[PDB]
Write a protein that holds these residues in place. Structure first.
Motif, PDB file in Angstrom:
ATOM      1  N   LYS A 272      10.004   0.344 -32.217  1.00  0.00           N
ATOM      2  CA  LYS A 272       9.073   0.044 -33.308  1.00  0.00           C
ATOM      3  C   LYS A 272       9.281  -1.387 -33.963  1.00  0.00           C
ATOM      4  CE  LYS A 272       5.832  -0.009 -34.466  1.00  0.00           C
ATOM      5  NZ  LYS A 272       4.620   0.141 -33.534  1.00  0.00           N
ATOM      6  N   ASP A 275       8.404  -4.139 -31.582  1.00  0.00           N
ATOM      7  CA  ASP A 275       6.827  -4.086 -31.630  1.00  0.00           C
ATOM      8  C   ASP A 275       6.211  -4.969 -32.616  1.00  0.00           C
ATOM      9  OD1 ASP A 275       4.450  -2.898 -30.516  1.00  0.00           O
ATOM     10  OD2 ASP A 275       4.118  -1.898 -32.249  1.00  0.00           O
ATOM     11  N   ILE A 276       6.645  -4.760 -33.960  1.00  0.00           N
ATOM     12  CA  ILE A 276       6.230  -5.542 -35.061  1.00  0.00           C
ATOM     13  C   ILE A 276       6.498  -7.010 -34.615  1.00  0.00           C
ATOM     14  CG2 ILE A 276       6.200  -6.006 -37.502  1.00  0.00           C
ATOM     15  CD1 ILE A 276       5.145  -3.113 -36.099  1.00  0.00           C
ATOM     16  N   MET A 278       6.856  -8.487 -31.723  1.00  0.00           N
ATOM     17  CA  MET A 278       5.905  -9.219 -30.825  1.00  0.00           C
ATOM     18  C   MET A 278       4.615  -9.421 -31.566  1.00  0.00           C
ATOM     19  SD  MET A 278       7.398  -9.177 -27.862  1.00  0.00           S
ATOM     20  CE  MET A 278       9.055  -9.396 -28.916  1.00  0.00           C
ATOM     21  N   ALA A 284       1.099  -9.667 -29.417  1.00  0.00           N
ATOM     22  CA  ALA A 284       1.473  -8.819 -28.440  1.00  0.00           C
ATOM     23  C   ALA A 284       1.879  -7.436 -28.867  1.00  0.00           C
ATOM     24  CB  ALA A 284       2.524  -9.610 -27.544  1.00  0.00           C
ATOM     25  N   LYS A 285       2.382  -6.592 -28.094  1.00  0.00           N
ATOM     26  CA  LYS A 285       2.666  -5.137 -28.543  1.00  0.00           C
ATOM     27  C   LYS A 285       3.775  -4.581 -27.428  1.00  0.00           C
ATOM     28  CE  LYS A 285      -1.377  -3.043 -26.511  1.00  0.00           C
ATOM     29  NZ  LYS A 285      -2.923  -3.352 -26.564  1.00  0.00           N
ATOM     30  N   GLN A 286       4.502  -3.911 -27.767  1.00  0.00           N
ATOM     31  CA  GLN A 286       5.181  -2.534 -26.953  1.00  0.00           C
ATOM     32  C   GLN A 286       4.083  -1.594 -26.513  1.00  0.00           C
ATOM     33  OE1 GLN A 286       7.970  -5.057 -27.461  1.00  0.00           O
ATOM     34  NE2 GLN A 286       8.108  -3.675 -25.719  1.00  0.00           N
ATOM     35  N   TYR A 288       2.620   2.465 -24.738  1.00  0.00           N
ATOM     36  CA  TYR A 288       2.855   3.506 -23.912  1.00  0.00           C
ATOM     37  C   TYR A 288       2.563   3.800 -22.507  1.00  0.00           C
ATOM     38  CZ  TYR A 288       2.791   5.551 -28.855  1.00  0.00           C
ATOM     39  OH  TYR A 288       3.130   5.742 -30.174  1.00  0.00           O
TER      40      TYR A 288
END
Ligand SMILES: Nc1ncnc2c1ncn2[C@@H]1O[C@H](CSCC[C@H](N)C(=O)O)[C@@H](O)[C@H]1O
Ligand SMILES: Nc1ncnc2c1ncn2[C@@H]1O[C@H](CSCC[C@H](N)C(=O)O)[C@@H](O)[C@H]1O
Ligand SMILES: O=C1c2cccc(O)c2C(=O)c2c(O)cc(O)cc21
Ligand SMILES: O=C1c2cccc(O)c2C(=O)c2c(O)cc(O)cc21
Ligand SMILES: [Cl-]
Ligand SMILES: [Cl-]
Ligand SMILES: [Cl-]
Ligand SMILES: [Cl-]
Ligand SMILES: [Cl-]
Ligand SMILES: [Cl-]
Ligand SMILES: [Cl-]
Ligand code: NA
Lengths: 321, 319
Positions: A272, A275-276, A278, A284-286, A288
């Motif tokens: 998490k 992710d913030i 990125m 961007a993002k991590q 699922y």
């Protein structure tokens, strides 16, 4: 956190700041093997005022980074890794705690309100993260050095859960220093190991071929195994799917694309946080498993198998159906 | 190990709480209310994906609580709902380039040993020079300082008798919150605040003077007050202030110092001690250090009292 914790969360950046100064100033090195150092002698070496350095120590002692003796001051049991220049803690400080991250953090709320193509980082620096890395020799070597740590930790169980012994040629896309291939090569000997990445100056390691190119262009074929490790999470869908198209466009059937990333689980502080990071750095993002299957399906890929190396790290086997 | 890396990365916790408050999302979470992230995103023109991700992170660190309703602030983080909370004002005041860029310079200021503070090395001008230039930062500074004064008033009036004084001067009093609060409970006195103003403040029964305590200080007051002033100055400058205090005073006149005393029973002092080094090239002081500068300025420490856990009162006479 003694009843009221919100203030301790807010001020606790000061703890980061104090650890950073201790490291950045270059004093952390003298506390190797739990040695007790005299601050005055230490202060006298680097030409720092004794009072200021003695006071910084007092704060580092309170938070539990340092320990007090009758003669000198040493690192605590849990903070020993601050003395080691090749530890995940030391390298995290070296890479993360700087203007590139901290000034981008102060811009992050403005980037949320200004919905545009610009990331919080680009809004500050007026360049891409990796464009800025290639222009700054020091940060890139610090980036690679810390990334090298995260490959070394999966290397042990990665070789157990997957058969690299059954692959003639192997290409690592956005591999930087071939630390993934270097550590794999040591175990699985007598194969073709290739690393494609943007190098201003090319690196070399015995048995590793360092290709110089861009993975937004068609990727060279002839490889049975393509691998993307912590690359897709640096890009949004439009850019990430375009990379997988070039993998799909380069893989003749009977071949596999390996993807190793911090798979987002419902309840993970580590993923998490990253992710913030990125979003802030690259917009961007991590992802699922379902988000990967979706972007995989877009270019035109299918997953033979997915399984986790660590709690955070997971492996996805992809093929051109 | 677990502890060392948590200390290093916990700035992200600060950074996340800052983005929440700074973006203006904090106000819709009052009275333990549960907010629909989708309408919250739609309202502020924030991408739902980016917000719900940020929210998730706040839920993990414990700032927010997840539910079927939506999301709310946690009981222990309720104070982000309140825009004149000590927590909310600390975020607005402390989380900005001014502090964070100066923190990045702090190791340079140590090694490059000169009079220039980490803050001066970034901004090229002193902290108070920079603060007097920017009305937004000064208002934020004064707002957070006002909170720290308000905590002291109650037990400040109990241990020291202002009733026995008639002419009181607050040196570096800023907005004059100390005198404003004391004046309400203690009436019929001459309350004067000396500071550096552009437009001098207005308040009933409070006199506001433009002044510099590095120049000779006005005489004919029986009580002088220095509250959180000396920790902004190194010894030579702190001595120059206390020296101007002595020369302003006579016998039968008293000087009050209210600082965060460097007493190990205080939790926050050592962190603020490094904050003062970084911003001003100054420090918090032990009682022995105050004794030192008082003697050099020709003052005597008459009494010393604990206001509370962090704050201490020092009574000084000329002799
Ligand atoms: N256009 C591009 N073409 C190829 N590589 C690129 C690229 N833009 C960025 N990269 C590389 O992508 C990498 C992402 S970081 C991942 C490093 C490595 N795979 C590991 O797991 O340790 C960086 O090394 C960066 O140099
Ligand atoms: N040379 C100078 N002469 C007078 N006041 C000064 C000064 N330099 C700084 N100051 C003031 O000293 C104050 C220090 S901060 C303390 C504010 C207030 N006493 C409180 O307790 O909250 C600031 O308001 C600053 O503007
Ligand atoms: O901070 C991390 C990180 C932290 C702990 C464990 C990690 O694996 C990572 C990681 O992989 C990572 C990354 O790939 C790219 C980043 O910009 C930052 C990080
Ligand atoms: O950060 C603080 C602070 C924090 C907690 C408790 C505090 O009292 C203070 C305080 O007094 C203070 C100050 O007087 C001047 C500053 O620049 C900063 C601070
Ligand atoms: Cl990735
Ligand atoms: Cl990164
Ligand atoms: Cl707000
Ligand atoms: Cl909506
Ligand atoms: Cl001025
Ligand atoms: Cl002070
Ligand atoms: Cl003493
Ligand atoms: Na000034």
């Amino acid at each position: 956190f003694q009843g009221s914790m919100l203030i301790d969360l807010i001020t606790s950046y000061r703890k980061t700041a104090a650890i950073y100064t201790f490291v950045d100033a270059g004093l952390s090195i003298h506390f190797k093997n739990g040695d007790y150092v005299d601050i005055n002698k230490l202060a006298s070496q680097y030409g720092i005022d004794y009072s200021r350095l003695n006071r910084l120590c007092d704060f580092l002692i309170e938070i539990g980074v340092l320990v007090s003796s009758d003669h000198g001051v040493a690192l605590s049991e849990e903070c020993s890794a601050l003395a080691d220049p090749n530890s995940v803690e030391f390298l995290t400080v070296k890479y993360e705690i700087n203007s590139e991250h901290w000034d981008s953090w102060l811009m992050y709320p403005k980037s949320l309100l200004e919905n545009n193509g610009k990331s919080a980082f680009e809004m500050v620096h007026g360049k891409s993260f990796f464009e800025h890395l290639d222009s700054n020799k020091g940060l890139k070597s610090d980036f690679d050095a810390l990334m090298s740590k995260y490959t070394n930790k999966i290397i042990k169980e990665l070789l157990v859960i997957y058969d690299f012994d059954k692959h003639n040629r192997i290409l690592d896309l956005g591999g930087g220093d071939g630390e993934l291939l270097i550590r794999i090569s040591e175990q699985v000997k007598g194969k073709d190991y290739t690393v494609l990445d943007r190098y201003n100056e090319v690196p070399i390691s015995e048995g590793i071929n360092f290709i110089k190119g861009d993975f937004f262009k068609p990727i060279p074929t002839g490889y049975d195994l393509y691998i993307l490790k912590n690359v897709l999470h640096n890009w949004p869908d439009n850019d990430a799917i375009s990379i997988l198209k070039n993998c799909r466009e380069a893989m003749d059937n009977n071949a596999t694309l390996l993807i190793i990333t911090l798979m987002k689980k419902p309840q993970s502080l580590v993923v998490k946080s990253v992710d913030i990071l990125m979003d802030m750095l690259f917009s961007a993002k991590q992802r699922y498993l379902s988000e990967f299957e979706d972007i995989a399906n877009q270019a035109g890929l299918v997953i033979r198998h997915y399984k986790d190396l660590d709690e955070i790290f997971s492996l996805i086997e992809l093929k051109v159906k």
